[PDB]
Design a protein around this ligand. Structure first.
Ligand SMILES: [N]
Ligand SMILES: [Pt+2]
Ligand SMILES: [Pt+2]
Length: 162
């Protein structure tokens, strides 16, 4: 069992725009292990829709190349929980954000979180934000992460982080 506590009172409209994947953590090493790993994904943009769904623009390394993926995340009765069907995942969970600097979120397959859970620390600007990383560490304290990666500004500004 992995238990998640998402942000109460998330206004999805105020997350719109460019983000950078500053850090990642996964329950299973193999999810992130290599450059090719199935959940090694780099957020470019969050685009909320008026009716409160969420488009996720990400980059992923598959066919020798650093390729674009669009994920449609459909809203649920919980503003911080969205339904997806991509990367073999079916849930997006928004743990926390201050809207103007950082956003923490997880994807998982609800059918098996321990082989599935991947969480990221996003920032709006391509700079290491030590506040953001500490919030990510605290949000991860009660999650059973087995791989954790943090990127430097050089890796931030890059195609699939170099
Ligand atoms: N929050
Ligand atoms: Pt909040
Ligand atoms: Pt574990």
């Amino acid at each position: 069992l992995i238990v998640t506590q998402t942000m109460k009172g998330l206004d999805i409209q105020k997350v719109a725009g460019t983000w950078y994947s500053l850090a990642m953590a996964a329950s299973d090493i193999s999810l992130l292990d290599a450059q090719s790993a199935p959940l090694r994904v780099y957020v470019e943009e969050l685009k909320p829709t008026p009716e409160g769904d969420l488009e996720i623009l990400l980059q992923k390394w598959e066919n020798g190349e650093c390729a674009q993926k669009k994920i449609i995340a459909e809203k649920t009765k919980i503003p911080a929980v969205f339904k997806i069907d991509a990367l073999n995942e079916n849930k997006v969970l928004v743990l926390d954000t201050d809207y103007k600097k950082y956003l923490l979120f997880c994807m998982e397959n609800s059918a098996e979180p321990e082989q599935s859970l991947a969480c990221q620390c996003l920032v709006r600007t391509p700079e290491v934000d030590d506040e953001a990383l500490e919030k990510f560490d605290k949000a991860l304290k009660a999650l059973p992460m087995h791989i954790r990666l943090s990127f430097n500004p050089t890796q931030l500004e890059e195609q699939c982080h170099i």
